[PDB]
Amino acid sequence: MEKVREIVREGIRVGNEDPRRIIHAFKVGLALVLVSSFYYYQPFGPFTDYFGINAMWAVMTVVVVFEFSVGATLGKGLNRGVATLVAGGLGIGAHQLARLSGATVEPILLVMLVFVQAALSTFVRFFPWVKTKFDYGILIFILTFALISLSGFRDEEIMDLAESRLSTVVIGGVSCILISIFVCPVWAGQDLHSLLASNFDTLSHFLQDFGDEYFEDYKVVEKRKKNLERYKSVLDSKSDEEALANYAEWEPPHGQFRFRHPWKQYVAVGALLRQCAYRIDALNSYINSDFQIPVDIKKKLETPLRRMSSESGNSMKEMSISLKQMIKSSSSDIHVSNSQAACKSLSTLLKSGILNDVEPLQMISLMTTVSMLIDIVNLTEKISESVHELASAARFKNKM
Amino acid sequence: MEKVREIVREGIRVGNEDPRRIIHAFKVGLALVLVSSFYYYQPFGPFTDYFGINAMWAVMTVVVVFEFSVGATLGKGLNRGVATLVAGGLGIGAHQLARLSGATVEPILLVMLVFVQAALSTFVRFFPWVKTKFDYGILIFILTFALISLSGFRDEEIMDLAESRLSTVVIGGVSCILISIFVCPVWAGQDLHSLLASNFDTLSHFLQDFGDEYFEDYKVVEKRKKNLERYKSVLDSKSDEEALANYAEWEPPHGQFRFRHPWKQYVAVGALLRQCAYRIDALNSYINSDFQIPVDIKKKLETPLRRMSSESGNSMKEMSISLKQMIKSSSSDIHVSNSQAACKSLSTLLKSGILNDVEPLQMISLMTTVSMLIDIVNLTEKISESVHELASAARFKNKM
């Protein structure tokens, strides 16, 4: 009974985290009901249905194809469709060849052919291109060829078997795609934009909180987590962006995403973000570290460091907005220009020999922190140029 | 014809990179031949085979289940088996209920039941636990329940259909597992140990080459790549280690890996490595950067930095050996003790005010580099303690 409480609480938090999960749970059931009802009531034409398993293969197609996003289901559906078509052609051809062979040398030749093409296809599944894009395609290639060949079906129930398999795959896939596109879409493109916006948000949060924390029982652990996990979720989000990009390259042009949309460049912006997160990780590890300088030595450099940190944080916040709501903004320009001014003023302040009363070890720590903030400022300028150009050249809402 | 050259060259390099890929390509074909031949020649008992599709489902099971590793195929096979068993029980029960309902209210109740359980299962597929371990299990749960229910099969061909599906899944899965275990195994545990060893190797390479490069037309780009990509492959290897760990938790106890083996701790060691790679990334970005100090200011600190870098590099090399060949070694202890001695001597050298003739900006760059090397030394000590304990407490070849 205790596990009932635990599991229903995990269910509650999963549902509250993203309600589109609940609507997708209903969409799967709607697809199953739709296909099954299509095959029960023969709507306009009762197919030949010589085998009696059409409903089986259609329900299995719908269950395996229907994924969360729209690009995911469209990719799986298109892979399954094309692979079934090609493997059906080769299955009919190979079976005609083996029937031309003889009557007893027929299973030997069929088994040899299945062995050859399954070996070649399993080896091709290791290539980088085919793996990143069309791995399910090669899987269904092997599946359908081995279906049409290695199944103990007669020589005249093959032209009908492949045709029925293709028809059923087409119907299940089309049902899946139409429901997933027209009911309550979950586009992978929007999810990528929103993931990048969330990452920008967490980095800006850390930068402001750091600017205020560098110069200062269970609440301590609360603050420590608020510093750690917030950025630590950016470092572990490369596979997620690389997945959403792949899923996004399949979708059709919906509202504000034209035909040719540069997803590779958005993954590049994500990589630049992750570089900023490397540097921020080093900064945090310098916050938590044991060896702590007295406060006044940091207070003598407080002003430029605080200005640099806060300005880069605000610039990342504005990039977050301009990536989420897809509205072309240009305030990051001002927020990065003032950052450059702060870095220059810090250089001129260091030229004054103010650091001639400090132990060399404290000099190591202090100079490391200054160098970190300078690096994050420059990287923020790079990301701002990248996003500004990527939006200007992609026709966002330039109206401001 | 040009694409023929290109594709056969990619095939050659993929084969030469890892020949176990070729042997696995042959293993898939051997599994298909084995199962098909088992179903053609009825070996000891010709099953009832009331539907005529047993060979289809067995070949499809083998094609979908058989993966590269041994843990991968064992996981997919066990998930498919258990999910088919449970969903078969529920399918028979639900169908008995719906037959008890009536004769015309039967399809309505069956469709409602399929909708309910497909919705609940699709929602459960989003949990973190079920997603990381048993997602294919829930997929086959939905598949088999919808097979037994939504297929237009009569009321008495259901007790036989589920039984035949379970039998066929069992035979295909057992064939896959036995071939994958007894022919030429590809253990995911060994692949994880070897991946960690490769990562350690690349980091040691960078540390030595950096120790020699910090103090110095197309060969320049060669050296630049040799610095960049070597460590840049460590940053992008979190999903791979996290995959091989999951695959490794399924395998049975083979030669030197006992029953309870701590894979979570090895993924933790991988994470520590990736922290060292963050710091190394900052170091490399300081190498390539435009603002370059004259050489003599670095030469005045050459000795301790060179000693620290080379000692930590050798220590990482010995950890690589002790992780690859699974032999318990303790030379990293000496190689980290001398590192601590170098760091202490560097502190005493800095206490001498030797840095009183240098511009503060050059001070920023120099002190940042010194702080980086100190951080990597300490992190190497942490990883060495972790691996030394993880090996001592797991009974490696302590004989040295």
Q: Give the integer Cα–Cα distance in Å for A157 and A68.
A: 37
- Distances in Å between the Cα of A71 and the Cα atoms of A67, A166, A188, B178 are 9, 22, 6, 37
Mutation choice for A interface testing from B34, B113, B135, B150 by most A CBs within 10 A: B150
Please check whether residue A232 touches B, CB under 8 A: no
What tokens does B329 get? Answer: 């070694």
Contact A349, B360 (CB under 8 A): no
Q: How many angstroms separate the Cα of B207 from the Cα of each of A196, B211, B320, B371?
A: 33, 6, 14, 15
Distances (CA, A) of B367 to A235, A310, B275: 26, 24, 20
Beta bridge partners of B397: B327
Helices A106-124/A135-150 angle, 10° precision: 170
Q: Do A111 and B55 touch (CB under 8 A)?
A: no
- Name which of B175, B171, B168, B170 is nearest B27 in CA terms: B175
User: What are the structure tokens assigned to B101, written together?
Assistant: 């309902």
> Is the distance from CB of A368 to CB of A303 less than 8 angstroms?
no
Q: Where are the domains of chain A?
A: 2-182, 188-392
What the block records as the tokens of A374 is 């300078």
| Residue A159 burial class via C-beta count within 10 angstroms: exposed 0-12, middle 13-18, buried 19 and up | middle
CA dihedral for B230, B231, B236, B242, sign (positive or negative): positive
What contacts A274, CB < 8 A, 6 or more positions away?
A: A234, A235, A237, A238
Gap from A397 CA to chain B (nearest CA, Å): 35
Q: Which two three-digit tokens encode residue B399? A: 């004989």
Other beta carbons within 10 angstroms of residue B252's beta carbon come to 11
Q: B367, B376, B377: which to substitute to probe chain A, counting the most A Cβ within 10 Å?
A: B367
Could B282 and A281 be called an inter-chain contact, meaning their C-beta atoms sit closer than 8 Å?
A: no
Optimal mutation site among A275, A278, A377, interface B, most CBs of chain B within 10 A? A278
Min distance B210 CA to chain A CA atoms (Å): 19
Number of neighbouring beta carbons within 10 Å of residue B217: 4
Q: Which residues of chain A lie closer than 8 angstroms to B360, CB-CB?
A: 350-351, 353, 355
Cα separation, B400 vs B396, whole angstroms? 10
| Amino acid sitting at position B214 | Y
| Residue in A170, A124, A161, A186 with CA at minimum distance from that of residue A49 | A161
* CA B365-B371-B372 angle, 5° bins: 90
| CB within 8 Å of B397: residues ≥ 6 apart | B326, B327, B328
Give the residue among B332, B295, B285 at the shortest CA–CA distance from B313: B332
Which residues, other chains included, contact A328 with Cβ-Cβ below 8 Å and sequence gap of 6+?
A322, A391, A392, A396, A397, A398, A399, A400
Query: B19, exposed or middle or buried, with CB in 10 Å at 0-12, 13-18, 19+?
Result: exposed
Find, in chain B, the residue whose alpha carbon is nearest to that of A60: B143
Contacts of B361 in chain A (CB under 8 A): 347, 350
Q: How far is CA B74 from the centre of its chain?
A: 15
The dihedral through the CA atoms of B131, B137, B141, B142 has a sign that is positive
Q: Is B49 left (phi over 0), alpha (psi -120 to 50) or beta?
A: left
- Integer Cα distance of B293 and B301 in angstroms: 13
User: A328 near A400, Cβ under 8 Å?
Assistant: yes
Q: Are A287 and A214 in contact (CB under 8 A)?
A: yes
- In terms of C-beta distances under 8 Å and separation of at least 24 residues, what long-range contacts does B78-81 make, across chains too? B78/B173, B78/B250, B79/B134, B79/B136, B79/B137, B79/B140, B80/B136, B80/B137, B80/B140, B80/B169, B80/B173, B81/B169, B81/B170, B81/B173
* C-alpha span between B128 and B257 (Å, rounded): 28
To 5 degrees, how large is the angle CA A28–CA B122–CA A67?
60
Rounded to a whole number of angstroms, the distance from the CA of A155 to the nearest CA of chain B is: 15
Are the C-beta atoms of B238 and B270 separated by less than 8 Å?
yes
A87 vs A232: CA distance, rounded Å: 46
What whole-number distance in Å separates Cα of residue B274 and Cα of residue B235?
Answer: 6
Is A157 in contact with A231 (CB distance < 8 Å)? Answer: no
Which of B84, B122, B154, B238 best tests the A interface by mutation, with the highest count of A CBs <10 A? Answer: B122
Residue B177 CA neighbour count, 13 Å, CB half = 18
Instruction: In whole angstroms, give the CA distance from residue A30 to residue A28.
Output: 5
Q: Tell me the residues of chain A between 245 and 274 that have a Cβ less than 8 Å away from chain B.
A: none
Find out if CATH 1.20.58.220 is the number for domain B188-392: yes
Give the relative orientation of helices A106-124 and B2-17 as an angle to the nearest 10 degrees. Answer: 80
Distance from A127 to chain B by nearest Cα, in Å?
Answer: 7
Rg (C-alpha) for chain A, rounded Å, is 29
Helix, strand or coil, per DSSP, at residue B359: coil
Amino acid at B150: L
CB B322 within 8 A of CB B332: yes
Say which residues have a Cβ less than 8 Å from residue A216's Cβ, sequence separation at least 6.
A295
Compute the distance between CA of residue B309 and CA of residue B274 in angstroms, rounded to an integer. 17
Please identify among residues 160-219 of chain B the ones whose CB lies closer than 8 Å to any CB of chain A. Answer: none
A25 vs B64: CB contact, 8 Å cut-off?
no
Structural contact between residues B82 and B137, judged by C-beta atoms closer than 8 angstroms: yes
> Which of A16, A20, A63, A288 should we substitute to test contact with B (largest number of B Cβ atoms within 10 Å)?
A63
Nearest to A122 by CA among B5, B57, B73, B133: B73
> In terms of CA atoms, which chain A residue is nearest residue B122?
A25
Of B22, B63, B126, the CB nearest to A146: B63
Q: B164 CB contacts (<8 Å, ≥6 apart)?
A: B47, B48, B49, B50, B51, B54, B57
| B53: its two tokens | 């599709």
CB A283 within 8 A of CB A300: no
Question: Cβ of B29 and A115 within 8 Å?
Answer: yes
Does residue A329 sit in helix, strand or coil? coil
Q: Could you tell me if B270 and B199 are in contact, meaning their C-beta atoms sit under 8 angstroms apart? A: yes
Q: Is A126 on the interface with B (CB under 8 A)?
A: yes
Residue A117 to residues A110, A114, A145, B5, B68: CA-CA distances in angstroms? 11, 5, 9, 20, 18
What are the structure tokens assigned to B198, written together?
Answer: 């490769």
Element (H, E) at A37: helix A20-40
A18: number of CA atoms within 13 Å, CB side?
Answer: 10
8 Å CB contact between B313 and B384? no
Residue B230 per-residue DSSP state: H
Question: Which residue in B153, B165, B142 sits closest to B107, CA to CA?
Answer: B153
In sequence order, which ranges of chain B are alpha helices (DSSP H)?
Answer: 2-17, 20-40, 54-65, 70-101, 106-124, 128-133, 135-150, 159-182, 188-213, 218-235, 239-248, 263-288, 295-299, 302-324, 331-350, 360-392
Residues on chain A touching B365 (C-beta within 8 angstroms): 371
A49: number of CA atoms within 13 Å, CB side?
A: 14
In angstroms, the CA B336 to CA B314 distance is 9
d(CA B69, CA B74): 9
3-state secondary structure of A50: coil
- Count the residues in chain A: 400
Cβ separation B151–A111 shorter than 8 A: no
The DSSP output letter for A154 is -
Phi, psi of B397 (to 5 degrees): -75, 80
B39 close to A (CB below 8 A)? yes
Residue A250 near residue A374, CB atoms below 8 Å: no
Please name every residue paired with A327 in a beta bridge, in sequence order, or none if there are none: A397
Q: How many helices (H) and strands (E) does chain A have?
A: 16, 0
* Exposure class string for A37-54: b at 16+ Cβ within 10 A, else e: eebeeeeeeeeeeebebb
For A248, phi then psi, to 5°, come to -80, -20
DSSP code at position B185: -
Which residues, including other chains, have CB under 8 Å from residue B220's CB and lie 6 or more apart? none
- Retrieve residue A116's tokens: 């050859």
CA B164, CA A5: separation in Å to the nearest integer?
Answer: 37
By Cβ distance, the residue of B150, B275, B278 closest to A55 is: B150
Max CA-CA distance within chain A? 98
Contact B150 A36 (CB under 8 A): yes
Method underlying the structure? cryo-EM
- Rounded to a whole number of angstroms, the CA Rg of chain B reads 29
DSSP string, A261-324: --HHHHHHHHHHHHHHHHHHHHHHHHHH-S----HHHHHTTHHHHHHHHHHHHHHHHHHHHHHH
